[PDB]
Amino acid sequence: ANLWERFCNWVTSTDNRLYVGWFGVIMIPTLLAATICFVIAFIAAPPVDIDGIREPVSGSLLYGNNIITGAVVPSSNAIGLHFYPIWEAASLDEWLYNGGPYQLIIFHFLLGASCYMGRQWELSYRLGMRPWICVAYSAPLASAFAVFLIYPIGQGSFSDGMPLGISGTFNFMIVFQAEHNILMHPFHQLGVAGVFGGALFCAMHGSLVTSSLIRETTETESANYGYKFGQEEETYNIVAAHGYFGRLIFQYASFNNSRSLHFFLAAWPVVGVWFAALGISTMAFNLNGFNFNHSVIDAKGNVINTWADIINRANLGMEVMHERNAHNFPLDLA
Amino acid sequence: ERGWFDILDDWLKRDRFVFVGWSGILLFPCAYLALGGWLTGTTFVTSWYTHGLASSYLEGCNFLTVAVSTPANSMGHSLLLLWGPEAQGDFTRWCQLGGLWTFIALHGAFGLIGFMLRQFEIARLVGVRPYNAIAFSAPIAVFVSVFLIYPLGQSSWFFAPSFGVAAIFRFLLFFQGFHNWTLNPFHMMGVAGVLGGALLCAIHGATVENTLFQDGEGASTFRAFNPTQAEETYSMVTANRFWSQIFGIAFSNKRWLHFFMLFVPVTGLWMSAIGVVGLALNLRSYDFISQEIRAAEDPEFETFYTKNLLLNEGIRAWMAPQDQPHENFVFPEEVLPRGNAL
Amino acid sequence: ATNRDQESSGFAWWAGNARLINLSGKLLGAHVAHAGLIVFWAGAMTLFELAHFIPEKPMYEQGLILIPHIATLGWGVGPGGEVVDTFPFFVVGVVHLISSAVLGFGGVYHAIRGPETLEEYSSFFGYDWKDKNKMTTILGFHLIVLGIGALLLVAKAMFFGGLYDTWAPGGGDVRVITNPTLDPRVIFGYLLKSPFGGEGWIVSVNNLEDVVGGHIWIGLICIAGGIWHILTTPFGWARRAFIWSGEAYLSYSLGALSMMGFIATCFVWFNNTVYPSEFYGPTGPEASQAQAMTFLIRDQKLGANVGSAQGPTGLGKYLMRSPTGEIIFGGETMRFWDFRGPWLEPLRGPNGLDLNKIKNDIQPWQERRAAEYMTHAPLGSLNSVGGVATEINSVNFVSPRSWLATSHFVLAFFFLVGHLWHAGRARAAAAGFEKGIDRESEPVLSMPSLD
Amino acid sequence: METLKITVYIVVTFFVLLFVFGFLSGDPARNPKRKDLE
Amino acid sequence: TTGERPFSDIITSVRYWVIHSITIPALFIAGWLFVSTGLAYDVFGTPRPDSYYAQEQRSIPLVTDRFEAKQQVETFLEQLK
Amino acid sequence: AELTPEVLTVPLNSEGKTITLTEKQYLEGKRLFQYACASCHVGGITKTNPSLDLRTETLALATPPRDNIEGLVDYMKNPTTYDGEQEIAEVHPSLRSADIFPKMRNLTEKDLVAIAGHILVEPKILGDKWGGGKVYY
Ligand code: CLA
Ligand code: CLA
Ligand code: CLA
Ligand code: CLA
Ligand code: CLA
Ligand SMILES: CC1=C(/C=C/C(C)=C/C=C/C(C)=C/C=C/C=C(C)/C=C/C=C(C)/C=C/C2=C(C)CCCC2(C)C)C(C)(C)CCC1
Ligand SMILES: CC1=C(/C=C/C(C)=C/C=C/C(C)=C/C=C/C=C(C)/C=C/C=C(C)/C=C/C2=C(C)CCCC2(C)C)C(C)(C)CCC1
Ligand SMILES: CC1=C(/C=C/C(C)=C/C=C/C(C)=C/C=C/C=C(C)/C=C/C=C(C)/C=C/C2=C(C)CCCC2(C)C)C(C)(C)CCC1
Ligand SMILES: CCCCCCCCCCCCO[C@@H]1O[C@H](CO)[C@@H](O[C@H]2O[C@H](CO)[C@@H](O)[C@H](O)[C@H]2O)[C@H](O)[C@H]1O
Ligand SMILES: [Ca+2]
Ligand SMILES: [Cl-]
Ligand SMILES: [Cl-]
Ligand SMILES: [Fe+2]
């Protein structure tokens, strides 16, 4: 029982209140670093010159922001994709002006969240579980990579990464629509099906199981006391639920195999959000949504507007106003 | 007493491939007409006289750009009955005036009522609790608030959403430019309900599938389940330990878990419906007054809040003339807001 | 029907190829038939590209991804990348197409006619997944093959015509590479560059001498390691670290392919040396720099002093400094100042863009090249309407760089998911709980409670 | 700044080594069923 | 089961296909002719490519009155020469 | 509205002679314009120099006048600056510079007339949209 084996057995121990594990060894310091910088920056960071034009944006609470307008502001467009750790600045004041905090937060967060996904695989191995919960988490994790790393890479700048804030998120979405017509991209449309469908099936499965709970309580007590943690028997009647839902639609539109029902609950939102993640990641390389601008032409050649053209009008409004001082030449090529 | 009423009851409630029921008398014609109106309209009907838009396959639109568009703003909130005073029984004029839109919206509303009565009716015959019907109140609250209350607060049906893919996208962008709807906390709660619903759906399904008991020998685990078995097919104890150690907390009560899954998306949709009720009256969350006072006086103060209003101002000025043709907006080039160069 | 239903094999039809794991003879067939599909597509797609090819239009206006690969190797093209002979494109396509029939023939024979298992038939072609010595020997054979493949590129560069060199004096031309870089500080120094802006890791290789010399090193390394793995068996530290199973080996390869797909995505997006802009179109950074160049030229012709023109922000309207002082193009393209390209470097002095060269030495061919790249920026819709998202229909264009990057990010992403899927399953199967928790032996019931 | 740089470099190297040696330390055997994996 | 004949039974039966090898193409051709005769245009009031505008006008024939909307459209249709 | 011979009748030269294009010429003009010109001139603007558009009024005040078939055909052979003072074949596609603008190598005289005709007819159809830019999209 030497000191390395002792340490390895503590790291991988299934008795720690929170599992550490080898992924946790990377996860814990990087998440702590990103969390601490985020909280400090959100409260007290001075304004940041996001678009490199000496026009600093205030993101913190102490500089005039509330919870809704506050953000950690992306690093300067002058930096582009250059690496900007604290030690590359002449001073902290320089680092703060140029959006240093943004880079520190997202690189530590992306490392930590990737290790969070490995940690989910790791604990499942230690407990004798099947391994694929982490595959479900790869969907939100891929989305975070898309708006914090991949989109900046294809566009050449972390200054077009998603801001770390509520109104900053909306800004990112609006400019994205102007520059990629994301609403008209089938991968965003599949993503909407993923999350609308996921919410529908969530309410569906919750209502059907709750509708077929087996009477185990009186009316003055919560029905939740009718289930006991660890009990061997199922708490609801899947045959009654399938009998209801099969009649609601038709018998073969209903699941009677709990395993494939639950697999379907897993797959539908995860696949949809993979496509949403891939939408952002491929619009990062400027393969944009469908363009039907002036697609319908009459016999003389007059343009006949469709709803696609009305969308284009709205997009032009976002295009011409965004980053109003940042363009000197007529095309916004990135 | 076995009169005609009870005999009729017998026939409506026969176990057949498609259950019918009393609710089916309302549900089936209304659902069928709403769907057939949408297919008829998107295949053959124009929006030229109401919007200045082509909107059918007949005209060259595709699945993304077809729509059944709203009536012209000058129709106000007219029911636009086929036999009413605008179309006067003329089926062709009715189509050109937007009569298909109220037709779809109204038959759809009553179709939705009939679907929910069907959930109640079947639940009562089978002997289950009616929570599926209660959960369906959230889609009904959304449909009623967006497609009926919202235009009823505005000037006419014209500003309701049109029934089409790209037409709904225009509705999203209108709501950003005019209402600053992303800023509205009722929308925010709805976003939380929908994304948290999708999250719970993914996480519950994945957790079950990865805590299964080995109840068979095959590598495909689906076969090792029997609908009448008495045992749980997955380990709630192992699932609980996994999540407590991964995330800190875990479900321990399976009934609470599944109620929560009902609760989260349903509450979210209800909250978003309330905010749209406000937007019927233009009662928006458009501004933060404290930000505007500071920014008016201090031309160096800039936030993501002030950056987004500039975008909304672009949206309004650049889309209004085409999107609201009845208003006759003529905006010369020199008045349009634009940044440098663009 | 050996293992051809769910009852015999344990695998449902939707996982039916898992029935092949221990049927090496049918597994051989599946792999060989599949390589035939790859070679078929390469052959047939080339011929399609050739049939649809107009030599007067730039390749990048024509939706070509394979002919640009052939042209980069020096076949069919002359100075400036002009097509002088389409016959090599024809040959490459025909020979790949004819070969796919041979591979398809072998694949179908082994898949349905030959021995299902090879162990009874040949101990040389037979294998057990758990035999660490045999698996590294098969691995060694394929490393030697890959190493020969890397040397074929060297042979083409040094002895059989050379490579297309976008940087060649006089506008770009095929050039024989006579002195490939062999200094391992150069070759391996690429591996230790930061991957961030201005460094770019191996994506930044910008001259053919380094490209060729790197393939010499890779060829030797693959041949050496291939001999090493024929002669050796995994060491004890290696034995204890890995899972030794078919599905495990698949998962390691899936991880490696995903990583390569991500690297290729960036290579084609940023690099303009082994993906010449003449053939692939300008990079995103390139087109953005080209716009600044175009309007500097236009406005200077009208009489503007572009050196001293203060823009609306206070930064120069045409020219400014990078954060380390270099003179760079202004406007939003400030983010792209790391771009290097043959049409721009003649204006570069020690301090960056040189104002005297800008004022005096801009040639018409540079104005031509910047205007062409500005108007072929890699932006466009999914239905191939070129330009920004708000542009009207007219121009049928999506850059090959966009097609190649988006496809390979999507494939690399799903191959990362496939790695997680098969690595997690390989681990669980090895340990014996990939089908579920044993009710009588549930590990969590033997553990102390957390609280 | 230079001192900060060396500290971070040393800190990061430290945790990466724990990660690598940790997974090198017979990790397949750290499961509740079959240990004998080699 | 609810007593109706299984779908798989029906759609593999020669009699099903004897009937529907006629009724399906007959309906398809009916839909085709509904468009190709130009009847669809006139049932629903949809402009042909040459009837969105008059030859020199560029204004939309937009309906602007609620109770004279029918006449407004009829007036717009006259003005197409 | 229809593409009529009136629409397709355009000035042949500066002296007032007209020529009437066929629908086939016009559609050929559109396709060839897309092939050789639209990368910079989509919609009648000029991406690499927005000060100059292809509106007929702008072409009328060029030197020599370019608002007719002969002026436009001559421009595609030997383009000049707006004031005619300089020859810009080295930077603008033309038959004179087909060696460096290879897409011009397979344009025949008949093709130049159809491209010219497209440029003169499109404003009669599109009005302000032609040469108007994004404001009129
Ligand atoms: C590249 C794709 C690919 C390849 C190479 C294979 C290969 C194989 N599959 Mg898999 N499979 C695939 C995709 C593929 N599969 C997909 C997409 C699915 C899901 C639908 C499956 C689901 C599946 C199941 C459920 C099973 C297999 C099985 C097999 C093996 C035996 C098949 C057999 O006996 O057919 C017999 C069929 C025929 C003889 C009919 C025609 C087959 C030939 C080969 C058609 C070739 C036509 C071609 C044009 C001829 C060219 C000739 C020319 C070169 C001269 C074989 C190695 C079986 C297995 O594992 O056995 C142990 C098995 O049970 N597969
Ligand atoms: C070299 C790559 C490779 C190889 C050799 C394998 C091999 C295998 N996989 Mg793995 N897998 C891979 C990559 C690979 N996989 C990747 C990249 C992913 C991420 C998506 C997966 C995800 C995955 C899962 C979730 C599972 C497997 C399984 C398996 C086993 C059964 C496979 C089968 O029969 O499918 C049969 C093939 C089909 C049923 C057809 C799928 C059709 C696809 C989805 C259509 C894709 C659309 C297409 C690209 C474009 C549209 C075409 C349309 C317009 C016509 C087999 C050992 C199974 C397993 O674990 O067994 C041990 C299993 O459950 N794989
Ligand atoms: C490396 C992959 C790759 C890339 C980058 C390209 C790129 C291109 N192709 Mg090529 N091609 C490919 C593979 C590729 N192709 C394959 C496999 C075939 C045989 C089917 C072809 C056959 C082909 C023809 C016949 C033609 C092209 C053409 C083109 C050009 C226009 C493409 C276009 O408009 O698509 C339109 C875009 C789509 C159809 C989007 C596809 C969406 C898919 C279905 C999503 C799949 C997602 C994922 C894979 C599935 C995951 C499922 C999940 C559950 C796991 C473009 C340069 C055209 C050209 O210009 O030639 C000169 C042309 O005519 N290609
Ligand atoms: C990697 C692919 C591969 C592998 C490992 C095998 C392996 C095998 N084959 Mg199969 N086969 C393949 C592809 C492959 N084959 C192809 C492409 C075809 C169509 C030509 C066949 C058609 C085939 C038939 C008809 C038969 C076999 C048989 C066999 C078995 C005995 C072979 C032997 O002893 O040859 C000894 C070795 C040689 C004769 C040396 C051959 C050298 C080749 C022909 C020259 C090229 C070498 C060079 C590396 C090629 C580069 C190709 C690259 C560019 C793609 C053995 C298991 C036999 C069998 O199954 O018995 C029951 C058998 O009867 N194969
Ligand atoms: C397809 C190529 C391939 C594959 C699959 C293998 C596989 C194997 N090799 Mg072989 N090898 C190869 C090519 C390959 N080799 C070549 C070309 C050579 C000549 C250089 C060798 C020389 C060689 C030797 C001397 C040894 C092996 C050994 C092994 C075994 C242990 C592998 C291991 O632990 O890696 C894990 C990797 C490490 C432990 C590296 C250190 C960890 C660092 C920190 C990870 C860095 C990752 C980072 C993201 C890097 C990004 C890029 C980077 C360059 C910047 C394994 C079976 C071992 C063995 O058992 O021999 C019998 C062994 O001693 N190989
Ligand atoms: C309105 C109205 C009415 C009614 C009418 C109706 C009722 C109709 C119906 C109609 C219908 C009922 C129609 C239908 C149609 C259908 C369709 C048109 C479909 C199509 C489809 C498709 C196209 C598909 C596609 C796909 C998908 C989606 C996915 C999968 C794959 C595929 C690709 C296949 C009346 C007379 C009363 C009165 C007057 C008014
Ligand atoms: C196994 C299996 C499978 C698969 C299969 C495969 C994958 C196969 C492949 C196959 C192949 C891969 C094949 C191929 C073939 C080829 C060929 C057969 C070719 C031919 C050619 C020719 C004849 C040519 C001609 C020509 C010339 C020479 C000149 C130019 C022109 C032309 C083109 C005409 C599946 C999935 C189904 C399932 C079952 C099992
Ligand atoms: C050709 C060329 C070149 C060169 C290249 C080279 C020379 C490369 C190399 C490369 C390399 C040399 C690479 C390497 C890689 C590695 C890797 C990728 C590794 C990985 C590892 C792993 C994955 C591990 C894992 C683990 C851990 C960590 C713990 C324990 C357990 C296990 C084992 C699982 C240049 C650029 C000059 C130019 C251009 C052309
Ligand atoms: C920059 C990264 C460098 C990576 C270097 C790769 C070189 C590979 C050589 C690894 C050295 C071998 O030494 C490796 O470490 C120690 C030696 O005390 C052992 O360590 C472990 O042994 C066993 C594994 O069964 C465990 O139960 C135990 O908890 C632990 O002590 C490893 O089992 C041995 O394999
Ligand atoms: Ca060996
Ligand atoms: Cl902005
Ligand atoms: Cl700019
Ligand atoms: Fe459940």
Residue numbers in the entry:
A (entry chain A): 11 to 344
B (entry chain D): 11 to 352
C (entry chain C): 23 to 473
D (entry chain I): 1 to 38
E (entry chain E): 4 to 84
F (entry chain V): 1 to 137
Quote the original article.
Photosystem II (PSII) produces dioxygen by extracting electrons and protons from water, which takes place at the oxygen-evolving complex (OEC), an oxo-bridged Mn4CaO5 cluster with a shape that resembles a distorted chair. Here we use pump-probe serial femtosecond crystallography to reveal the structural dynamics of PSII from nanoseconds to milliseconds after illumination with one flash (1F) or two flashes (2F). We identify structural changes associated with electron transfer, proton release and water delivery at various regions, including QA–QB, YZ, the OEC and the O1, O4 and Cl-1 channels.
By Δt1 = 5 ms, these difference densities disappear entirely, indicating the completion of the electron transfer together with the restoration of QA and the non-haem iron. The distances from two carbonyl oxygens of bicarbonate (BCT; BCT-O1 and BCT-O2) to the non-haem iron increase from 2.16 Å and 2.28 Å in the dark state to 2.43 Å and 2.44 Å after 5 ms of 1F. At Δt1 = 5 ms, a large positive difference density appears between BCT and D1-Y246, consistent with our previous discovery, and the distance between D1-Y246 and BCT-O1 decreases from 3.21 Å to 2.82 Å. At the completion of Mn4 oxidation by Δt1 = 200 µs, a negative difference density emerges on O5, suggesting its instability, which is subsequently stabilized at Δt1 = 5 ms. These structural changes might stabilize the positive charge on the OEC. In correlation with the outward movement of Ca from Δt1 = 30 µs to Δt1 = 5 ms, one of the carboxyl oxygens of D1-E189 located close to Ca shifts slightly away from Ca. Because the movement of Ca is larger than that of D1-E189, the Ca–D1-E189 distance decreases from 3.02 Å (Δt1 = 1 µs) to 2.86 Å (Δt1 = 5 ms). The subsequently decreased difference density at Δt1 = 5 ms could be attributable to a stabilization effect of the positive charge on the OEC.
